[PDB]
Design a protein around this motif. Sequence first.
Motif, PDB file in Angstrom:
ATOM      1  N   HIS E   8     -26.895  90.105  60.121  1.00 57.23           N
ATOM      2  CA  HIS E   8     -26.847  88.749  60.656  1.00 57.23           C
ATOM      3  C   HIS E   8     -26.403  87.784  59.570  1.00 57.23           C
ATOM      4  O   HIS E   8     -27.053  87.708  58.523  1.00 57.23           O
ATOM      5  CB  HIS E   8     -28.220  88.349  61.197  1.00 57.23           C
ATOM      6  N   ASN E   9     -25.310  87.063  59.834  1.00 54.98           N
ATOM      7  CA  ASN E   9     -24.801  85.966  59.004  1.00 54.98           C
ATOM      8  C   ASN E   9     -24.496  86.416  57.574  1.00 54.98           C
ATOM      9  O   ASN E   9     -25.115  85.969  56.610  1.00 54.98           O
ATOM     10  CB  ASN E   9     -25.773  84.780  59.005  1.00 54.98           C
ATOM     11  N   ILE E  10     -23.519  87.305  57.448  1.00 55.85           N
ATOM     12  CA  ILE E  10     -23.177  87.908  56.165  1.00 55.85           C
ATOM     13  C   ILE E  10     -21.927  87.223  55.631  1.00 55.85           C
ATOM     14  O   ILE E  10     -20.819  87.485  56.092  1.00 55.85           O
ATOM     15  CB  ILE E  10     -22.967  89.417  56.287  1.00 55.85           C
ATOM     16  N   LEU E  18     -15.889  88.126  53.034  1.00 62.53           N
ATOM     17  CA  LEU E  18     -16.361  88.278  54.400  1.00 62.53           C
ATOM     18  C   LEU E  18     -16.860  86.932  54.899  1.00 62.53           C
ATOM     19  O   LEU E  18     -17.695  86.297  54.250  1.00 62.53           O
ATOM     20  CB  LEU E  18     -17.472  89.330  54.489  1.00 62.53           C
ATOM     21  N   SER E  19     -16.342  86.499  56.041  1.00 65.59           N
ATOM     22  CA  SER E  19     -16.745  85.251  56.671  1.00 65.59           C
ATOM     23  C   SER E  19     -17.913  85.522  57.615  1.00 65.59           C
ATOM     24  O   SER E  19     -18.589  86.542  57.487  1.00 65.59           O
ATOM     25  CB  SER E  19     -15.562  84.615  57.387  1.00 65.59           C
ATOM     26  N   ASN E  20     -18.177  84.593  58.534  1.00 66.06           N
ATOM     27  CA  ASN E  20     -19.286  84.651  59.481  1.00 66.06           C
ATOM     28  C   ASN E  20     -19.245  85.924  60.323  1.00 66.06           C
ATOM     29  O   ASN E  20     -18.380  86.071  61.191  1.00 66.06           O
ATOM     30  CB  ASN E  20     -19.225  83.432  60.399  1.00 66.06           C
ATOM     31  N   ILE E  21     -20.170  86.846  60.074  1.00 69.02           N
ATOM     32  CA  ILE E  21     -20.128  88.183  60.654  1.00 69.02           C
ATOM     33  C   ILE E  21     -21.512  88.519  61.186  1.00 69.02           C
ATOM     34  O   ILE E  21     -22.497  88.454  60.445  1.00 69.02           O
ATOM     35  CB  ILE E  21     -19.665  89.237  59.631  1.00 69.02           C
ATOM     36  N   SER E  42     -14.955  96.582  53.077  1.00 69.76           N
ATOM     37  CA  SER E  42     -15.933  95.774  52.365  1.00 69.76           C
ATOM     38  C   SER E  42     -17.235  95.655  53.144  1.00 69.76           C
ATOM     39  O   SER E  42     -18.316  95.606  52.545  1.00 69.76           O
ATOM     40  CB  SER E  42     -15.347  94.396  52.083  1.00 69.76           C
ATOM     41  N   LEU E  43     -17.152  95.611  54.475  1.00 66.81           N
ATOM     42  CA  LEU E  43     -18.356  95.569  55.296  1.00 66.81           C
ATOM     43  C   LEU E  43     -19.119  96.883  55.219  1.00 66.81           C
ATOM     44  O   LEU E  43     -20.354  96.889  55.236  1.00 66.81           O
ATOM     45  CB  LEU E  43     -17.997  95.241  56.744  1.00 66.81           C
ATOM     46  N   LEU E  44     -18.404  98.003  55.111  1.00 64.55           N
ATOM     47  CA  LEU E  44     -19.071  99.291  54.968  1.00 64.55           C
ATOM     48  C   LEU E  44     -19.773  99.401  53.621  1.00 64.55           C
ATOM     49  O   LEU E  44     -20.853  99.989  53.526  1.00 64.55           O
ATOM     50  CB  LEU E  44     -18.064 100.425  55.124  1.00 64.55           C
ATOM     51  N   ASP E  45     -19.186  98.829  52.571  1.00 64.62           N
ATOM     52  CA  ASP E  45     -19.847  98.867  51.274  1.00 64.62           C
ATOM     53  C   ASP E  45     -21.005  97.885  51.210  1.00 64.62           C
ATOM     54  O   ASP E  45     -21.955  98.101  50.452  1.00 64.62           O
ATOM     55  CB  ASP E  45     -18.846  98.588  50.160  1.00 64.62           C
ATOM     56  N   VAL E  46     -20.952  96.811  52.000  1.00 68.51           N
ATOM     57  CA  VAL E  46     -22.069  95.874  52.053  1.00 68.51           C
ATOM     58  C   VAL E  46     -23.237  96.481  52.823  1.00 68.51           C
ATOM     59  O   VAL E  46     -24.393  96.404  52.389  1.00 68.51           O
ATOM     60  CB  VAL E  46     -21.604  94.534  52.656  1.00 68.51           C
ATOM     61  N   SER E  54     -25.167  90.272  44.479  1.00 66.64           N
ATOM     62  CA  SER E  54     -25.090  88.859  44.119  1.00 66.64           C
ATOM     63  C   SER E  54     -24.498  88.036  45.255  1.00 66.64           C
ATOM     64  O   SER E  54     -25.115  87.073  45.724  1.00 66.64           O
ATOM     65  CB  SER E  54     -24.267  88.680  42.847  1.00 66.64           C
ATOM     66  N   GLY E  55     -23.305  88.404  45.717  1.00 67.35           N
ATOM     67  CA  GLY E  55     -22.611  87.616  46.717  1.00 67.35           C
ATOM     68  C   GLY E  55     -23.110  87.762  48.136  1.00 67.35           C
ATOM     69  O   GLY E  55     -22.647  87.022  49.009  1.00 67.35           O
ATOM     70  N   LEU E  56     -24.030  88.692  48.390  1.00 67.00           N
ATOM     71  CA  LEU E  56     -24.539  88.917  49.738  1.00 67.00           C
ATOM     72  C   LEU E  56     -25.420  87.746  50.157  1.00 67.00           C
ATOM     73  O   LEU E  56     -26.320  87.340  49.416  1.00 67.00           O
ATOM     74  CB  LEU E  56     -25.313  90.229  49.792  1.00 67.00           C
ATOM     75  N   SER E  57     -25.152  87.196  51.344  1.00 64.11           N
ATOM     76  CA  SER E  57     -25.797  85.970  51.800  1.00 64.11           C
ATOM     77  C   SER E  57     -26.355  86.119  53.209  1.00 64.11           C
ATOM     78  O   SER E  57     -26.310  85.177  54.001  1.00 64.11           O
ATOM     79  CB  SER E  57     -24.822  84.798  51.744  1.00 64.11           C
ATOM     80  N   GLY E  58     -26.884  87.293  53.534  1.00 62.60           N
ATOM     81  CA  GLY E  58     -27.442  87.529  54.847  1.00 62.60           C
ATOM     82  C   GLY E  58     -28.394  88.703  54.805  1.00 62.60           C
ATOM     83  O   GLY E  58     -28.497  89.415  53.805  1.00 62.60           O
TER      84      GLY E  58
END
Lengths: 118, 118, 121, 571, 567, 107, 107
Positions: E8-10, E18-21, E42-46, E54-58
Amino acid sequence: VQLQESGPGLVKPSQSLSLTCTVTGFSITSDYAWNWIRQFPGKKLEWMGYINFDGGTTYNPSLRGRISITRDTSKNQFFLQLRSVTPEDTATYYCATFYGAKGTLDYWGQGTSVTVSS
Amino acid sequence: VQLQESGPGLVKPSQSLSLTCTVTGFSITSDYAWNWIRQFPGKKLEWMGYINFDGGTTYNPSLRGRISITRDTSKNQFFLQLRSVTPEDTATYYCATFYGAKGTLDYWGQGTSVTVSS
Amino acid sequence: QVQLQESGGGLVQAGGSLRLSCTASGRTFGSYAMGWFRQAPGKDREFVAAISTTGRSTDNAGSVKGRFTISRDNAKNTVYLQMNSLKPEDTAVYYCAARAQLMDRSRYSYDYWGQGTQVTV
Amino acid sequence: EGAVLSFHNICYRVKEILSNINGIMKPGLNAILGPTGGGKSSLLDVLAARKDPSGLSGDVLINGAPRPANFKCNSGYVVQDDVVMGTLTVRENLQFSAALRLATTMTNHEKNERINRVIQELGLDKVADSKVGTQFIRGVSGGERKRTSIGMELITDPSILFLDEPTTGLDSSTANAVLLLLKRMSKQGRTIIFSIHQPRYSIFKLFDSLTLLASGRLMFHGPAQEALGYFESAGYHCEAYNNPADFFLDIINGDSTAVPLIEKLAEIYVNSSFYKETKAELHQLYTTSFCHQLRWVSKRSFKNLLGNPQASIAQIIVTVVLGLVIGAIYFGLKNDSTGIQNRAGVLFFLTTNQCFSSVSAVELFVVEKKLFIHEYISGYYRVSSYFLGKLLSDLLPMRMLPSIIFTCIVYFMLGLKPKADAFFVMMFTLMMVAYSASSMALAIAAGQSVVSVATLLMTICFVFMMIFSGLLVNLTTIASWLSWLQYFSIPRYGFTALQHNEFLGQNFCPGLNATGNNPCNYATCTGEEYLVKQGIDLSPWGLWKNHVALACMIVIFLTIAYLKLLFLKKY
Amino acid sequence: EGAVLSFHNICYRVKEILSNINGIMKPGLNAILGPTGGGKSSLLDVLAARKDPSGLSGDVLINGAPRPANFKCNSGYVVQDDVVMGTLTVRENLQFSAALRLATTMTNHEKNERINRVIQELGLDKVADSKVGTQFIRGVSGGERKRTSIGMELITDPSILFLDEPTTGLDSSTANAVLLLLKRMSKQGRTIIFSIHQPRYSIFKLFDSLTLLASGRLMFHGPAQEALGYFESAGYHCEAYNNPADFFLDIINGDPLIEKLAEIYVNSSFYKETKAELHQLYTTSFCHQLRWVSKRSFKNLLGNPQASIAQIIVTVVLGLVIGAIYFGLKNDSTGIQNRAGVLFFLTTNQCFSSVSAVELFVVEKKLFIHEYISGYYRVSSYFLGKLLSDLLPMRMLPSIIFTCIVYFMLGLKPKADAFFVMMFTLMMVAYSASSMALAIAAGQSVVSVATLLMTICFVFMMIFSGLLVNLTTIASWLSWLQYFSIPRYGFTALQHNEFLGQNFCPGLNATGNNPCNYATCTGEEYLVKQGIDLSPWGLWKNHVALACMIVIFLTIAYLKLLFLKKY
Amino acid sequence: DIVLTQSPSSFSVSLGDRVTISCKASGYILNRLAWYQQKPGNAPRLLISGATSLETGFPSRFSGTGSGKDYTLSISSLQTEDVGTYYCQQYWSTPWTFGGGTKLEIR
Amino acid sequence: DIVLTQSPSSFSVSLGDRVTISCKASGYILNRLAWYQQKPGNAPRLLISGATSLETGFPSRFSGTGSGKDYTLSISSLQTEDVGTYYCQQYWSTPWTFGGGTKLEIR
Ligand SMILES: *[C@@H]1O[C@H](CO)[C@@H](O[C@@H]2O[C@H](CO)[C@@H](O)[C@H](O)[C@H]2NC(C)=O)[C@H](O)[C@H]1NC(C)=O
Ligand SMILES: *[C@@H]1O[C@H](CO)[C@@H](O[C@@H]2O[C@H](CO)[C@@H](O)[C@H](O)[C@H]2NC(C)=O)[C@H](O)[C@H]1NC(C)=O
């Protein structure tokens, strides 16, 4: 300084040879190199090989394993051992010294003759 | 073989120095190396530098560009030129020879004294 | 691949309690968006209903206001066509077809047909 | 205006590669499909006459009358990996192709007008003067690099144009773009035959003929849309919303199910209504001089040399800083007992450094092997003109520079023998050593495809060569059954020439004159004693003996490299 | 039995990657599509927690409760290029994974029984005892090498299994085969999330969910077949006989487009119910890892007949050549030159043949990163095992065979200690040069730059050896560079061992005094002329300098591995 | 360079006895050492070359021994002309260095 | 090796004149050449060392010149003891070779 050759003067062909040079007035472990020179009939000299003061030897490549030079430090002697004697070397054998700083054969022995025959 | 030094014995500070050693009995182009040795009051010798028989020079690294040694082959002379003379070197200057085969300073000059002052 | 076989038939004469089950013999069933067709002796092939894959939309004919109801479940590979109020224009044979991924309220695009079964009103 | 490339009963061995194959290629836009194990690319190389004609067992006919001798000249072949040169513009590449492929009778105006016509047909006006380029310097996109390579064979106006997979390696929109370009180009009366690898429907919907090939057997030949019309009659219905090319490759991998497969499909088609009428169709059936090629190959190679700021500037920079280091370590060579060791060490370092920096002449004839094969069999030049031009424009100005700058840096910092001839003989010796080592590099590395094996082979060869230089071993002490190996040693000739030039007339015992006689030997006071102790002659024939040995090695190695290029497998 | 990986909100920066996902991943067979420029990989690695947080925001949640600390341990990640080792069998690879990843409480019987269960589920009975292999020695096909790599992460029984493009690099029938394998594996209650690159219809027809991504924006998320049901309602008329995945990737480019498609997705009947779904929301010891890493590395060493046999062959023939050229060293004026030349050649040859220790830590960097962040071992155990099983038995052999060949052909100093000090010096020189090789080449991906860097470094090092320059004649502002020279210590130790007590002027005794100097008659005069001490501290001074260089370079290599960017 | 240290800077001897003057080097000289003698008012005069070889023009009461860095000049039964300063010089490395000088004086 | 060629195998001289015996080498010797003299019934006796340096125990009528490969022994104003055989030896390379011998005879 003073050298004399001695040994047999009538050896059989393909047998052996054994000479002896007795140095007096100098110790053969001290300073020089001690070598053998033979002279053929129809005088033509040839250098055979030396033994150093420390014990190393160097031979003529035209005597391929037939020559071996040893010494006896307790009585100031060095020997020549020439094996497989052909009837070609009916020479006159001298023992000499070699300084190396000067480079020349300074002192010689008076010389003995080896007549190989049968 | 026979060497004599000559020159001024009272020079001003930070001016110059000029010595002359005249060799007789030998030609300086022939066999040896020819050098200068100075001796301080409270006797302590120092080797300054030589000029070879063929013309090459070698100096002491503690005389950094102040020393220069030349020669005059037509009259058997070699010269010492020490520039920027401090009042420290009130020494006695000798000219000597050096064989190289032996290695030692065999023949010397009798020596002159340089009293730098004002 | 993806073979259809209907099951049903019978007779109630306008009592409205019929329910067919067109079972698809295949490996992947959840991709096909299928339908249902009718044909009486003498007329042409008429579309009655269609469901999507993993059902979210439906399609209905003109003579059917809320009369027919189509359902499915991808776990038990079957489509169901439920009927009620069986008025006499129903005496026909009922075919299930199965298009690629979409609806298409038409014919001559549906691949993998079945044998059909006859309903007697 | 038409160009029918018929072919009939083509078998092939190198392994029966191609089995019984028939077909007609009308002047439309023809296509060859199939998996990579099949003869998809082998049939294209057979029809384009760039596979060797031993195993060919059938007749390929052009409009009736058979295929001529010089068929590859009036034709085109776009290779799959682009052999266009990045360090040139598009217009210079087209000028090179037009100058080496067109006649000599037309002058610069008509040839430029033809190049303008070709560059105005394919739509390259925005990049007509920009460098083609890789990711090493600013360059154009990969969607027009391919059509730049396509335009290099449209100068001679071929009526038949072959292409080897013009979509592999490209992104999707660019691939669709050049497919629409070839579709527009086909309707001027030009036969376009190409293989392709797994096309989409937007590419498949614009074909005109199809040729399926699996395991060297013919699966289908006819129109493209009748393949979908035909495979349903054999009992293989294609699913809706499925790509027909993926449908054919799936039904041929056995993954598709009907609703020894290859032989069965082969003769389920051999007895169809597509084989018979094709069988009826079958049954009613240099340019320039040596000097011109030398000038143009040398010009293009020199432009590529000055257009690559890697192997031209960085060599000069590392040579200058290495010369400054060597001049700083050995500053002021004196005449003590350590004056012999420093001189022998620095001359050994120069003659070893030349042979080891001349190892990077591998990438003269390996990184452009495919371009050489393609432009040789396309009929551009001969092998001798290419060899002389590439040699004269890449080896000479980059091996004749570092010896000059290296000698000019280190000779007066070191304080070597202060003459003029002693300077120029040293420069000439370093030049000859560099040329001999690059000649051996070309003689080893010619006709290769992999780069690493020649570098490692030269590395072990030069490690074996520098033992015989005369520094690590005394060459007069090796046994006589082994000392004959020293005549195969380039650094031995270079080191011997430099040592003879340097050590003559020197005195190394300060204070002792040993020219008239040497008192107390084992002294090594003169330079002549050092030279004779190493086995070097003192006459003026030793120096030039080493030089003529280097010249003979240059000539022999360059002749071996030319014979290795001329006897290459050029097919 | 279920495993829902909600997210949610990554947003993400390293460049907003990665934008609003938003999205829900049910326990089926999920798929991530899109072009390579988009955030498909990039979403699979997240989501797999192997990108740096660091950059993960969700918030990525697993069945409710959030993602734990050791999430990468109870999971799987099949990398795209296969990091399985070719010089091993399939069963030995699975034994290695089971020994380093499972517990220590179960013994060989249950672990073998689990490996038999995994190898009997994926269908690898025909190649269960064959080498995996590349095109360097007889090996299996590429269609089961991929499922061998898949089976290496099924030992720990993950409920979520990530795969990075399991079709790129394969042929078509094999790709269809492992897709049917994953389709059969999904119905045991296992979530399978994977990216894929341009699938066909026979692969697309068996998905369960879809996630389109272009330029880091979300184009679609829902069921897979509703994507073609949905893209017609936006006004993109679907053509028949066209692949729907190719249709989506074609309408992304051409049939401000990305933002516009993003917020016609955002106000659809697929975004809202997904938003409602979102709004109601070591293992072993040091010795065990050391033993297993050393065992696998030694099996790979003896399973590769390139870098093990050919080195010994070239060493033996080089020793025979060097023993044949320098046969019978005599005591003339040319006895000094031959001895100095042959000892210089030995100490230069050791440092230049120890340059091929680049490919210890570069050709297996990706395997090291993957098995470090997967939780196999620690960095020190991997370093000690790889060192102890690759550097020691292949640098301790050529010095022994080289000395044993050349020492009696040359005729050097005929003692026993003069033999063993020479062998020990060659060993220390080889170890110091390989230590500098590891200190330069650690943490690299490209092989060539470390070889060229060591080449220019060793060319600069061999000038200071003492043969090309006299070390007592360099200016004092530059002569301090000689203490950074491995061949100087090796050459000085070999020269001190060889030249002591030798006479080189035949006929002249120069031990009591030297008549007529500039003569160099003794070996002590040659040693002092080069600047070498005559005490017994010069030899072992060189040896302790080599030991300190070994320790310093190995510590620098270990700190370069430990401080690596391991994400 | 190589500095040369003469530790007995001054002796105090009578007639007839035996005196040993010692020279000490920084590095290794390998018997490249010479001994000089400087009477007051003259130039230095070479006495022993090569650290053992006494040269002609001198009585055989002078002798030199030593090896490595240790060197010694021995005057056994010194006579009345042996008052003077004695220097030691290396000639191994080219910046040749002299000793500090040892002054003998008679009682 | 280095063979040494004495081309005048026999001379024919009277009293008082000056005779030059010439030796010739295969390779370069660099003044490493010695001259001997063998009276009949004795051992050879060293005469000139280093190709120019006449040693003591011989009158100064003998002289050696030459460089490179050319060498010559000159007896200026030969006296009556100079009847004998004269050999030339190199001592440059270790298999030392003698000349063929030049026999002088008096008239
Ligand atoms: C080294 O000594 C040789 C002779 O021992 C010198 O050579 C002679 O030199 C004189 C002039 O000084 C000439 O007249 C002779 O012709 C030379 N003879 C030969 C054979 O060369 C030589 O000059 C000395 N070295 C130097 C550098 O002067
Ligand atoms: C070289 O000469 C030295 C002396 O000049 C020799 O050394 C002496 O040898 C005797 C026995 O011959 C010993 O009694 C002395 O103790 C030695 N003195 C020293 C200072 O070592 C030496 O023996 C000679 N070289 C060889 C190889 O014998």
